[PDB]
Design a protein around this ligand. Structure first.
Ligand SMILES: *[C@@H]1O[C@H](CO)[C@@H](O[C@@H]2O[C@H](CO)[C@@H](O)[C@H](O)[C@H]2NC(C)=O)[C@H](O)[C@H]1NC(C)=O
Ligand SMILES: *[C@@H]1O[C@H](CO)[C@@H](O[C@@H]2O[C@H](CO)[C@@H](O)[C@H](O)[C@H]2NC(C)=O)[C@H](O)[C@H]1NC(C)=O
Ligand SMILES: *[C@@H]1O[C@H](CO)[C@@H](O[C@@H]2O[C@H](CO)[C@@H](O)[C@H](O)[C@H]2NC(C)=O)[C@H](O)[C@H]1NC(C)=O
Ligand SMILES: *[C@@H]1O[C@H](CO)[C@@H](O[C@@H]2O[C@H](CO)[C@@H](O)[C@H](O)[C@H]2NC(C)=O)[C@H](O)[C@H]1NC(C)=O
Ligand SMILES: *[C@@H]1O[C@H](CO)[C@@H](O[C@@H]2O[C@H](CO)[C@@H](O)[C@H](O)[C@H]2NC(C)=O)[C@H](O)[C@H]1NC(C)=O
Ligand SMILES: *[C@@H]1O[C@H](CO)[C@@H](O[C@@H]2O[C@H](CO)[C@@H](O)[C@H](O)[C@H]2NC(C)=O)[C@H](O)[C@H]1NC(C)=O
Ligand SMILES: *[C@@H]1O[C@H](CO)[C@@H](O[C@@H]2O[C@H](CO)[C@@H](O)[C@H](O)[C@H]2NC(C)=O)[C@H](O)[C@H]1NC(C)=O
Ligand SMILES: *[C@@H]1O[C@H](CO)[C@@H](O)[C@H](O)[C@H]1NC(C)=O
Ligand SMILES: *[C@@H]1O[C@H](CO)[C@@H](O)[C@H](O)[C@H]1NC(C)=O
Ligand SMILES: *[C@@H]1O[C@H](CO)[C@@H](O)[C@H](O)[C@H]1NC(C)=O
Ligand SMILES: *[C@@H]1O[C@H](CO)[C@@H](O)[C@H](O)[C@H]1NC(C)=O
Ligand SMILES: *[C@@H]1O[C@H](CO)[C@@H](O)[C@H](O)[C@H]1NC(C)=O
Ligand SMILES: *[C@@H]1O[C@H](CO)[C@@H](O)[C@H](O)[C@H]1NC(C)=O
Ligand SMILES: *[C@@H]1O[C@H](CO)[C@@H](O)[C@H](O)[C@H]1NC(C)=O
Ligand SMILES: *[C@@H]1O[C@H](CO)[C@@H](O)[C@H](O)[C@H]1NC(C)=O
Ligand SMILES: *[C@@H]1O[C@H](CO)[C@@H](O)[C@H](O)[C@H]1NC(C)=O
Ligand SMILES: *[C@@H]1O[C@H](CO)[C@@H](O)[C@H](O)[C@H]1NC(C)=O
Lengths: 412, 419, 212, 148, 50
């Protein structure tokens, strides 16, 4: 199937890759606090959008499905993470930003947006990583005669940077008029109250927002999903997860002198080479699961369908069976002699057929040994000659192809 | 402003010749790369980290991936061909007798040394001491180990010492080394009695010149620079291929598992195709640069295979081919991924200037030299060979007649002896 | 008064072990051979913070035992305070009207507790998280910082979320210290076989360093 | 096994078969048949898919021309060697060891072949060694005589 | 498609509607209204240059 043929000639053919499959899956997390998201999402009163409230979330296990399964939320847009995946992940810290806003204006709470809330009240980074949760809060936040306790910034000199915040009530200048700290022609107070009344249409009603920013780093995680740890395994090929660092390999104890603050270790070419266990605090080296190649060694099928296999660069304990320097070689009668090379294997090993019904593997002969009969007064002179005709074949040209690039790419 | 060399108005005149009174045997070292490390890279294991969610995208590019393994396999197979074209030129494993009676020449630093665990010569161990990531990549072994390449450079040298030109042309025919060197002097146009009359001096010049190769190779870091450069270029190319796995290419992250662990399929595929696109161009660039670099190594292996045949299995007449001077002989030494030739050469020395004439008048005949030149020291005229001052009485044996004294510009009058 | 900083003020740039490698990193560092300001304790003026501070001191029995950081410092805004009493290290963010020069007499927005030598520290405030690195060493030069190398180790990282533009040290009362400012620079760092940083190059100091 | 010419036929055939196969691949579009995208999606809906085909069909044609420029350079290196063996072995008598068959070269004859050339190099090989005693010089009347 | 249609000897099995090329495109067809099998060949034999 590799050669697209029902007949294969004498040779060595790299047919397939071999790798050791992982035996078991290992999960490790700190033995740590069902997370206080309830103290944010169910708080009695939320902040004004010009003066948004940030809570640090840390040192906890968080079942985000309590949020994303619920019918109580009008929007759950998420960026750089998909919300059904949050129960598998781990984070350094999380920041929950919370406020009341008019329902039409919620479309401004996303990366890359512009408009007076995004511009002058609360700006996301355009490379945000996090989820935005919002819901209609009319029965909580509207009141008879209007709720004036919630406000937005209408005016500023300049737009907010990502997660900038501004408290100031100083008079805005809308023209050439010097305002001198008082209102007038083109001079105005910079904040407006929403005045939420329950009579208002849905786009005018109050909504609550919570924005979760995820502090994703290779630093130690303090917020994690509910996902349970397993016991540890050593000296075996396993799939693994340490604090959300998924991988595959062999885990082994090692001499690496991690300083007390260091959490992961890395190689010359910046691959992850070791970790410290979040429960055990032992240093574990990581090495990849064994792999190489499957070079199939065959006489021609016109001679025999008998075959040998080289697990190329692999050791025979990881796969008669013979360990060559080129890899583990599998066949029968790999017997001690020397001959000229029929099929090459590497490091001076070669293989060939016996029709006694077998593929030999042997160290190759370089030629017959010959001590020349030298002495300081002996010469050999030829008494006769032979005229010899030697055929030498050389390539000189190749087929003059040409390709119509437009007709190849676009088919007219 | 750089200097091109010392300026020299050489003392040309229509009747002056310079002939060397003495000579130097010189030995000079030429180094050629012959092969490079047999890397391979599984294109699926490199691009997709061996993740099924990525591999099913990589199939959309079809046969793009198998032809990168076809190219790297062709480059790897020709490294064993290049090593065979150079060293495997000898049909039988010749060896020297136990006694080293080579006419005063001392090959002990050039021949094998069974003190060592691999039977390399003294100078081959200087060469082998001076020449100096695990996921997609793989390094294959060569077909000939250095212990087998050292048996070829031993046979391809025990044949030269015991039998000269002859073991290239057919079966090795033994000849005494002091006589082999006499027919190598005779091949550069120096009369063979120049060796036998100076044999101790010539062997001392050869032995002293091989001694200075130990010092050059023991001391000087740049000496093997051509081989170390081939090792460094392949290491710099691999370091670039591996560091490009850390590149982001416009995905949310460069770590493929950390995309799959954060995003759902229809969102993740859009990020993974950015990594596939960049990692495929990262590998196509490497394979294209290795196909070009392997052609430079092959062109050097074909040169090394012809210096082996023409310099080691022969006596080259091609100027500067087998070192700078009138070449006598060359010896191969193995080196890591290369070959080294020690080019034994005759260099004329201690020049002296003489009066000369094209022909000599006697009985109105013009006499011309059969071999060499006429010269005079003032009072007398002599024949000499061209490349070493050996003056002889002018006779009707060492000269041939044509025409008469009226025809030839600058002819001179001296009696030619009839023996 | 002034001194040449030599090669002082390198710290481990991240919490990752590395060994036998020349890693390259871009971060706030004290530039090599920078010109840094020297003070005797016989005073504690208010100093700018710029982008971050390298601070070092040399006193016979430790006179420097704390710092104030902020913009007003006087707690009329959220003001960071750090003090140590040889039994504990004590850290606060506060708006209570504590004194204008609160030497150690021999809103609680955040709180946390835990020439004979040269004591070295680095203070930086990226993303509003206040990071501290340090080293202590037996070296006995009085005038200048000692020409040589050591890597400062991370002590502390406080997620305070707060602005700083000035700082001021606190003195034991009933001896000298040096101050230099971090700048955004590329470095090449030599991690030893045991993972200690044991040499470095400032890649913008001069053409030879840019070549290295 | 007289294969140097058939190996050049095989490599150029295998490179074209790979170039044609690369038209069947999707490169991330809905289909590899360009007419079946145009016959299903309306202009600006289709151009997004057709640019994936154009990108992959440029990259696979540009891969073929690059490998052909490298294959052509080794055929030219072989044609310069064949042109040199025509001059030095056929039009002359080479003194260069192993350039021109093995043994001491007498002649060569050029035969044409598909995409190549064949030289029938004729050489003298010495064939029956016998041992003899030998000497550098002959002493006679105190004169040393050496052989011409 | 676009090409020269010629009625041809490629004896399709009764279930087979098309014959195919190495780029997976059509090499031959059965007519939707007749059991006629047609070879399809490219105009100019794949265009031509000038
Ligand atoms: C030339 O002389 C040599 C040495 O005397 C002969 O070589 C030996 O021949 C015998 C009998 O065939 C072998 O058993 C030995 O192994 C040979 N010794 C060596 C060192 O080769 C040789 O036969 C003589 N004749 C010819 C034609 O070479
Ligand atoms: C050939 O050259 C070698 C190396 O120059 C000579 O070997 C040395 O001989 C002395 C004799 O006293 C020994 O003490 C040394 O141990 C030898 N080796 C070295 C590296 O000096 C050798 O004598 C020369 N001559 C012959 C006939 O082999
Ligand atoms: C030819 O040149 C050689 C040097 O290449 C001369 O040989 C040296 O001569 C001096 C003085 O007699 C001796 O001390 C050295 O020991 C000699 N060297 C060697 C290697 O033997 C030689 O004298 C010159 N001969 C002529 C005729 O000029
Ligand atoms: C070899 O060269 C020297 C140096 O040029 C020659 O010496 C000169 O000879 C001419 C007469 O032939 C005088 O006019 C000069 O004064 C000489 N001296 C110099 C320094 O040139 C010498 O004659 C040449 N020998 C032969 C045999 O040609
Ligand atoms: C160079 O010139 C001298 C001239 O003196 C030649 O030597 C003289 O040759 C005659 C005849 O053989 C003798 O009678 C003299 O006694 C020789 N004189 C000397 C000083 O030897 C000499 O032959 C010429 N050069 C060479 C190389 O032979
Ligand atoms: C070599 O060159 C010199 C001039 O550089 C030639 O000398 C002249 O020879 C003619 C012979 O008839 C005289 O008339 C001149 O007076 C000579 N001139 C000088 C300056 O000597 C010399 O003949 C040339 N040699 C040959 C063989 O042509
Ligand atoms: C070389 O010798 C010949 C004689 O062998 C010289 O030729 C003669 O020169 C004289 C004087 O000029 C004439 O009278 C004769 O007629 C010449 N011819 C013969 C055959 O005698 C010749 O001049 C000499 N040339 C040189 C350069 O020395
Ligand atoms: C909020 O209140 C509801 C009331 O049913 C409760 O079920 C939930 O656990 C609380 N917390 C969150 C994060 O919704
Ligand atoms: C849990 O945390 C403690 C902290 O002291 C640690 O000692 C312990 O080993 C961990 N538990 C398990 C089962 O490892
Ligand atoms: C198969 O074997 C026979 C006998 O060895 C030979 O004549 C024939 O050519 C071979 N065929 C192939 C396809 O190798
Ligand atoms: C092969 O693997 C076994 C187990 O890891 C080990 O004991 C042995 O030394 C290995 N041998 C080689 C040549 O790799
Ligand atoms: C085993 O094979 C080696 C060459 O590979 C040979 O030198 C040795 O003599 C053999 N041993 C036996 C007992 O035949
Ligand atoms: C440091 O900079 C100040 C700038 O005014 C200068 O006065 C002082 O001499 C400088 N010190 C050195 C050692 O260059
Ligand atoms: C920090 O405070 C100063 C006033 O002391 C102010 O000018 C500056 O804009 C503030 N920076 C930030 C990032 O809040
Ligand atoms: C605490 O914060 C509030 C609001 O920012 C402020 O009014 C009060 O003065 C602060 N406390 C102190 C002790 O100043
Ligand atoms: C590294 O650790 C070893 C083993 O404890 C110690 O002997 C050596 O002095 C250390 N070297 C350095 C440069 O830290
Ligand atoms: C309709 O199609 C069938 C297909 O077998 C054909 O035999 C018949 O002649 C056609 N009739 C008409 C009226 O088109």
């Amino acid at each position: 199937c590799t050669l697209k043929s029902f007949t294969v000639e004498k040779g060595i053919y790299q047919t397939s890759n071999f790798r050791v499959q992982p035996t078991e899956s290992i999960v490790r997390f700190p033995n740590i606090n069902l997370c206080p998201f309830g103290e944010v999402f169910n708080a009695t009163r939320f902040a004004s959008v010009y003066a948004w409230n940030r809570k640090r979330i840390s040192n906890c296990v968080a079942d985000y499905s309590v949020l994303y399964n619920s019918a109580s939320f009008s929007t759950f847009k998420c960026y750089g993470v998909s919300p059904t995946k949050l129960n598998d992940l781990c984070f350094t810290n999380v920041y929950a930003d919370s406020f009341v806003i008019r329902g039409d204006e919620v479309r401004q709470i996303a990366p890359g947006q512009t408009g007076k809330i995004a511009d002058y009240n609360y700006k996301l980074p355009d490379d945000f990583t996090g989820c935005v949760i919002a819901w209609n809060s009319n029965n909580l936040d509207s009141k008879v005669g209007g709720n004036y306790n919630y406000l937005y910034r209408l005016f500023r000199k300049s737009n907010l940077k990502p997660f900038e915040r501004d408290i100031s009530t100083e008079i805005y200048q809308a023209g050439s008029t010097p305002c001198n700290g008082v209102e007038g022609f083109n001079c105005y107070f910079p904040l407006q109250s929403y005045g939420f009344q329950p009579t208002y249409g849905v786009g005018y009603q109050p909504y609550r927002v919570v924005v979760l920013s995820f502090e994703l780093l290779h630093a130690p995680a303090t917020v994690c999903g509910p996902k349970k740890s397993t016991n540890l395994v050593k000296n075996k090929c396993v799939n693994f997860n340490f604090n959300g660092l998924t991988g595959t390999g062999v885990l082994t104890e090692s001499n690496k002198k991690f300083l007390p603050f260091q959490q992961f270790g890395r190689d010359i070419d910046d691959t992850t080479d070791a970790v410290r266990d979040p429960q055990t605090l032992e240093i574990l080296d990581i090495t990849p699961c064994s792999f190489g190649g499957v070079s199939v060694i065959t006489p021609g099928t016109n001679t025999s369908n008998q075959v040998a296999v080289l697990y190329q660069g692999v050791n025979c304990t990881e796969v008669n069976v013979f360990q060559t320097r080129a890899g583990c070689l599998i066949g029968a009668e790999h017997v001690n002699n020397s001959y000229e090379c029929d099929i090459p294997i590497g490091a001076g090993i070669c293989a060939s057929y016996q029709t006694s019904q077998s593929i030999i593997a042997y160290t190759m002969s370089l030629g017959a040994e010959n001590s020349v009969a030298y002495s300081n007064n002996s010469i050999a002179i030829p008494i006769n000659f032979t005229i010899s005709v030697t055929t030498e074949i050389l390539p000189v040209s190749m087929t003059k192809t040409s390709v119509d690039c437009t007709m190849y790419i676009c088919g007219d | 402003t750089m200097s091109l060399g010392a300026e020299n108005s050489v003392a040309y005149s229509n009747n002056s010749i310079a002939i060397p009174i003495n000579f130097t045997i010189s030995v000079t070292t030429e180094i050629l790369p012959v092969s490079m490390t047999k890397t391979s890279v599984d294109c699926t294991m490199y691009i997709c980290g061996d993740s099924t969610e990525c591999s099913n995208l990589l199939l959309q590019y079809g046969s793009f991936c198998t032809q990168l393994n076809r190219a790297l396999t062709g480059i790897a197979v020709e490294q064993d061909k290049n090593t065979q074209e150079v060293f495997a030129q000898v049909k039988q494993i010749y060896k020297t007798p136990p006694i080293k009676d080579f006419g005063g020449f001392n090959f002990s630093q050039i021949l094998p040394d069974p003190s060592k665990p691999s039977k390399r010569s003294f100078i081959e161990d200087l060469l082998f001491n001076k020449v100096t990531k695990f996921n997609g990549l793989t390094v294959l072994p060569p077909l000939l180990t250095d212990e087998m390449i050292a048996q070829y450079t031993s046979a391809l040298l025990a044949g030269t010492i015991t039998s000269g030109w002859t073991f290239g042309a057919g079966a090795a025919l033994q000849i005494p080394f002091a006589m082999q060197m006499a027919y190598r002097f005779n091949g550069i146009g120096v009369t063979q009695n120049v060796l036998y009359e100076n044999q101790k001096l010539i062997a001392n010049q050869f032995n002293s010149a091989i001694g200075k190769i130990q010092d050059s190779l023991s001391s000087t870091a740049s000496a093997l620079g051509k081989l170390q450069d081939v090792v460094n270029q392949n290491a710099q190319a691999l370091n670039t291929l591996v560091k490009q796995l850390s590149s982001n290419f416009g995905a949310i992250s460069s770590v493929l598992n950390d995309i799959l662990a954060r995003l759902d399929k229809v969102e993740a595929e859009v990020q993974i195709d950015r990594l596939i696109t960049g990692r495929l161009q990262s590998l196509q660039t490497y394979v294209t640069q290795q196909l070009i670099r392997a052609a430079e190594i092959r062109a050097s292996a074909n040169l090394a295979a012809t210096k082996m045949s023409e310099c080691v299995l022969g006596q080259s007449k091609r100027v500067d081919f087998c070192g700078k001077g009138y070449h006598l002989m060359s010896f191969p030494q193995s080196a890591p991924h290369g070959v080294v030739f020690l080019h034994v050469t005759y260099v004329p020395a201690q020049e002296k200037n003489f009066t000369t004439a094209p022909a000599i008048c006697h009985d109105g005949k013009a006499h011309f030299p059969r071999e060499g030149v006429f010269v005079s020291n003032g009072t007398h005229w002599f024949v000499t060979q061209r490349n070493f001052y050996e003056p002889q009485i002018i006779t009707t044996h060492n000269t041939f007649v044509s025409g008469n004294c009226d025809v030839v510009i600058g002819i001179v009058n001296n009696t030619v002896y009839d023996p | 008064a002034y001194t040449n900083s030599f090669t002082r003020g390198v710290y481990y740039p991240d919490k990752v072990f590395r060994s036998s490698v020349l890693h390259s990193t871009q971060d706030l560092f004290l530039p090599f051979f920078s010109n840094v300001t020297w003070f005797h304790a016989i005073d504690n003026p208010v100093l700018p913070f710029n982008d971050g501070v390298y601070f070092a001191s040399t006193e016979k029995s430790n006179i420097i035992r704390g710092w104030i950081f902020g913009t007003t410092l006087d707690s009329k805004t959220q003001s960071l305070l750090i003090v140590n009493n040889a039994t504990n290290v004590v850290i606060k963010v506060c708006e209570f009207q504590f004194c204008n020069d609160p030497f150690l007499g021999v809103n609680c927005t955040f709180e946390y507790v835990s020439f004979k030598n040269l004591r070295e520290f680095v203070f930086k405030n990226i993303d509003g998280y206040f990071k501290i690195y340090s080293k202590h060493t037996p070296i006995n030069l009085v005038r200048d910082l000692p020409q040589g190398f050591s890597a400062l180790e991370p002590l502390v990282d406080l997620p305070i979320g707060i602005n700083i533009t000035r700082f001021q040290t606190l003195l034991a009362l009933h001896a000298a210290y040096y101050v230099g400012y971090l700048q955004p620079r590329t470095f090449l760092l030599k991690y030893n076989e045991n993972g200690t940083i044991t040499d470095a190059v400032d890649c913008a100091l001069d053409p030879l360093s840019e070549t290295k």
